[PDB]
Structure 1
Amino acid sequence: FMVSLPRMVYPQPKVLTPCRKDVLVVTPWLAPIVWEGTFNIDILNEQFRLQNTTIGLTVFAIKKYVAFLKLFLETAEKHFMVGHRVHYYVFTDQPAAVPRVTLGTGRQLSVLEVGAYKQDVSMRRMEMISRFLSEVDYLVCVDVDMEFRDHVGVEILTPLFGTLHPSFYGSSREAFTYERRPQSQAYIPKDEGDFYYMGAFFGGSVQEVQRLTRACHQAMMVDQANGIEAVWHDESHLNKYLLRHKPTKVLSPEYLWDQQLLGWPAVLRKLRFTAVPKN
């Protein structure tokens, strides 16, 4: 059950005035594409706070990538779901290397120990993700070699979402780096494909994320038994999944950007969550 919103004063939406004219803001299956200027965060904050929404954030920090945790968590504290309940799940082979980061109220961090792989480390995330049902309402699954630079909030939440890959949002579908070998479960032919989604940021309700990760894990297992590894590993399988199960929101590349690589184009009003230079 969902109680009434309170009285709120904000600018009237204008039917004959689009917010953004420069970009597609709804997919052909009527999912919002989330760009700055498309949402009133005050309305959304009210809607999700009234549900006492808890957001789980999963991140893997294996071997040397423990080095990225401090900046990742400190900036998440400043920018990610502020005002909402947050539960960080840090999966690592080095529990003692996890930095002590001060968390705001209503926010918690769990360290989950795993084994380390010698492709595999990136890939096995689907298996490891696939407790959450009892503890959080939504799950967000991100890369750790990243930092938050601006608001990432409840505007992303929905049953199932993907994020536009910053290198491909302007590309035609034959240019997308999908798995092209019919022998792989991740196969997508040249005349198929909506978008190229980034493996570094996806999520949804716990139920939908578990479905997704289960499906990708099963498909990767089939590929392995067939002696094939998809070209972009888990990302290839994510793309196949979101092709056949359309996401209910798509995040713009504001939500996954690399400023060193790609600068700050006109179409991006904010750079929210960005790659941290590495070697």
Structure 2
Amino acid sequence: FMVSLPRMVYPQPKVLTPCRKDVLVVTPWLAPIVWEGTFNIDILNEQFRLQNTTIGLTVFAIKKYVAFLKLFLETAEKHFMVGHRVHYYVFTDQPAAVPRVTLGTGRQLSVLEVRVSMRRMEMISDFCERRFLSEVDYLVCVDVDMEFRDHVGVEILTPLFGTLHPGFYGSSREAFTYERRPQSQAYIPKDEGDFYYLGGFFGGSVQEVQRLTRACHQAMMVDQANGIEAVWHCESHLNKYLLRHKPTKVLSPEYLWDQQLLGWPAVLRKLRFTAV
């Protein structure tokens, strides 16, 4: 079970004062949308540390993309789940090119050799299935050509989460780049859709992440057999899955931003994880 929190002194939440009035902070299925100002990280850290939470962070670094590992891992050390147990899983075709990065206590890295479009979904579902169940409580699946710039912590953890694509968070659903051909398993028509989620940042409990990756892998195989490739590949399938299986938290675009392409809008109080 879960033990009591200790006594804590913090500002009283005020019912007649919203945290943020400029953005939606809860979905219509009552999942929090995680923005700066919506969470007290001290309360959340207590809750998750009292469960001895271990977070797995997966990245694929193939061919030239191994060059991104050093900055990715060094900045993860500064910003990602600091204080909690972290297990990095680096999937690569070049185990010797993985940089030797100094890790904080309670943090470990495993290099897993591989070797295409389906490799990520396949590797996460039913190649590393048993290992992940034994080793971590949550999985966070991200792209490697990125850097952490600010806190990314236990506020994201939940059974299943997606992240709002920074190019589409203000867009009408008709403008979302979902797969629009009915012949694809990823098809979403013009009158459906909550959000446009990123392929590059999703996660959840190991069980829910394995369900998602298994479903996507199966859908991608069906499309391949039918001679169709979804417009945005695994991201299109991720969007179909999260439409039909609503995430239990949604991360705001603070969690995956491209400052060169999109600047630093007022609505973003922090830029936490960004394109290089």
TM superposition score category, shorter chain reference: over 0.9
Deviations 1:126-166 (A, max 9, x none): 01111000000000000000000000000000000000000
TM superposition shift of 1:257 = 0.1
Deviations 1:253-274 (A, max 9, x none): 0000000000000000000000
Partner SS, residue 140 of structure 1: strand
Partner SS, residue 139 of structure 2: strand
TM-score by length of 2: 0.97
TM superposition shift of 1:122 = 4.9
Deviations 1:35-54 (A, max 9, x none): 00000000000000000000
Deviations 1:18-57 (A, max 9, x none): 0000000000000000000000000000000000000000
Partner SS, residue 12 of structure 1: coil
Which of residues 120, 123, 126 in structure 1 aligns to 2:118? 123
Partner SS, residue 56 of structure 2: strand
Deviations 1:217-251 (A, max 9, x none): 00000000000000000000000000000000000
Following the alignment from structure 1 to structure 2, what is the Cα–Cα distance between the partners of residues 128 and 224? 18
Partner SS, residue 166 of structure 2: coil
Deviations 1:81-127 (A, max 9, x none): 0000000000000000000000000000000000xxxxxx4542101
Following the alignment from structure 1 to structure 2, what is the Cα–Cα distance between the partners of residues 254 and 122? 27
The count of corresponding residues between Structure 1 and Structure 2 is: 270
Following the alignment from structure 2 to structure 1, what is the Cα–Cα distance between the partners of residues 58 and 121? 11
Following the alignment from structure 1 to structure 2, what is the Cα–Cα distance between the partners of residues 94 and 244? 37
Following the alignment from structure 1 to structure 2, what is the Cα–Cα distance between the partners of residues 167 and 73? 25
Partner SS, residue 188 of structure 2: coil
TM superposition shift of 1:194 = 0.1
TM superposition shift of 1:215 = 0.2
Following the alignment from structure 2 to structure 1, what is the Cα–Cα distance between the partners of residues 123 and 5? 38
TM superposition shift of 1:191 = 0.1
Following the alignment from structure 1 to structure 2, what is the Cα–Cα distance between the partners of residues 154 and 219? 31
Partner SS, residue 117 of structure 2: helix
Partner SS, residue 82 of structure 1: coil
TM-score by length of 1: 0.96
| Root-mean-square deviation over aligned CA pairs | 0.5
| Number of the residue aligned with 2:184 | 184
Deviations 1:186-215 (A, max 9, x none): 000000000000110000000000000000
Partner SS, residue 122 of structure 1: coil
Following the alignment from structure 1 to structure 2, what is the Cα–Cα distance between the partners of residues 122 and 274? 23
4+ long deviations beyond 6 Å? none
Following the alignment from structure 1 to structure 2, what is the Cα–Cα distance between the partners of residues 224 and 275? 30
Following the alignment from structure 2 to structure 1, what is the Cα–Cα distance between the partners of residues 82 and 190? 41
TM superposition shift of 1:64 = 0.4
Following the alignment from structure 1 to structure 2, what is the Cα–Cα distance between the partners of residues 77 and 98? 16
Flag structure 2 segments of 5+ consecutive residues without an equivalent.
126-130
Following the alignment from structure 1 to structure 2, what is the Cα–Cα distance between the partners of residues 163 and 73? 20
Following the alignment from structure 1 to structure 2, what is the Cα–Cα distance between the partners of residues 123 and 152? 27
Go from structure 1 to structure 2 and tell me whether the alpha carbon gap of 1:251 and 1:122 turns closer, same or farther (over 3 Å shift): farther
Following the alignment from structure 1 to structure 2, what is the Cα–Cα distance between the partners of residues 261 and 41? 30
Matches within 5 A, 1:138-217: 138-217=138-217
